């Protein structure tokens, strides 16, 4: 799994032609050590590859890989502002707001332009994470129509729509830690779903996707919220650890060859 200028252009073809099937064998495995011999890469290809690759994991319901892809395009240092760096920080907030409730901090080796120029220019995205911590669907709807002019000029339409449904799913998972068997009528007041009939339809979508495990008790008009009865004692879990450890022993062997090469060349 190597990287080059050809691999960066392959991700651009998947953006125009909406078909993420060929982009699966070339993105499911992490890549390292680019192919270099006479010069075939540039700084613009390293920022356009991570920006185009993050959009594939976003639509594929793969938020675990989308957060890592969008983080590499921000940590790259620069001297001024650019269109790629601006769209990378705006999408970093919308992705982190779906998984957790607050935006993750930036590393120490990040660029200073993001925290001095991109941060004040992205005032419409920074205020969105402040209201998300309060968990209020009435106040979140007022920010969509207010910042509608900013989401259209920055071609960010569709990414903010996933955060609207994420607040309703977060309130259901929040009641699982506090409450246990809440009534169907009481669940339509905190989450605000207008009627108990709309509450039974929203909880059924999380069962098919696998975000939470619950059981609807129609005999009493309530709903139960239990945890996952998995002690991780199946023999299939041991094979996942052995398969994941095969990539750790290979990454250390590759770093030993690069460390001996630098020691051969004279340094200060």
């Amino acid at each position: 799994n190597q990287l080059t200028s050809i691999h960066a252009d392959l991700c651009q073809l998947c953006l125009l032609a909406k078909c993420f099937k060929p982009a699966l064998p070339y993105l499911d495995v992490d890549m390292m050590d680019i192919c270099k011999e006479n010069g075939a890469y540039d700084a613009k290809h390293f920022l356009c590859y991570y920006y185009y690759g993050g959009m594939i994991y976003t639509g594929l319901k793969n938020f675990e890989r989308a957060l890592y892809f969008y983080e590499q395009a921000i940590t790259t240092p620069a001297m001024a502002v650019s269109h790629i760096m601006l769209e990378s920080y705006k999408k970093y907030i919308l992705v982190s707001l779906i998984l957790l409730g607050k935006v993750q901090q930036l590393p120490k080796y990040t660029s200073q332009i993001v925290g001095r120029f991109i941060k004040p220019l992205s005032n419409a995205y920074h205020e969105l994470a402040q209201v998300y911590s309060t968990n209020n669907p009435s106040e979140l709807r007022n920010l969509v129509n207010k910042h509608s002019e900013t989401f259209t000029r920055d071609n960010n339409m569709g990414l903010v729509k996933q955060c609207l449904s994420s607040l309703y799913k977060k309130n259901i998972q929040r009641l699982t830690k506090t409450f246990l068997t809440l009534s169907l009528q009481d669940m339509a007041s905190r989450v605000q779903l207008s009627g108990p009939q709309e509450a039974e339809k929203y909880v059924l979508h999380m069962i098919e996707d696998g975000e939470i495990f619950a059981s609807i008790n129609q005999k009493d008009g309530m709903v139960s919220f239990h945890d996952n009865p998995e002690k991780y004692n199946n023999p299939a879990m041991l094979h996942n650890i052995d398969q994941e450890m095969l990539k750790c022993i290979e990454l250390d062997e590759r770093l030993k060859a690069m460390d001996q090469e630098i020691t051969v060349n004279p340094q200060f």
Partner: protein, 103 residues
């Protein structure tokens, strides 16, 4: 009046020693069971069981809705799993420091 102010603490220390010699054999002992053997009312039993557990002397949990003292003999581990959480937090902050030295 000097010894009268300490007559209450001496009576509470005796009830703690008897509860230790009786909770070892009985796994899930009843709450009214220890009150009948001690010949005391149930008003001070609920207040003494809270102070005994918080003082790291009596293990288990008190269940007022069932009058049964829970003592799971085959409960989950807590001596080995408490070290894996600290190793994960230390290795997470260490990876962010070794990667920040190469811009």
């Amino acid at each position: 009046p000097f010894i009268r102010e300490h007559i209450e603490e001496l009576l509470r220390n005796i009830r703690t020693q008897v509860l230790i010699k009786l909770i070892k054999p009985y796994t899930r002992i009843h709450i009214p069971f220890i009150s009948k053997e001690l010949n005391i009312d149930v008003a001070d039993v609920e207040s003494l069981l809270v102070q005994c557990i918080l003082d790291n002397t009596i293990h288990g949990r008190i269940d007022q809705v069932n009058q049964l003292l829970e003592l799971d003999h085959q409960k989950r581990g807590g001596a080995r799993y408490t070290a894996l959480d600290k190793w994960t937090n230390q290795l997470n902050s260490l990876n962010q420091a070794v990667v920040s030295k190469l811009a």
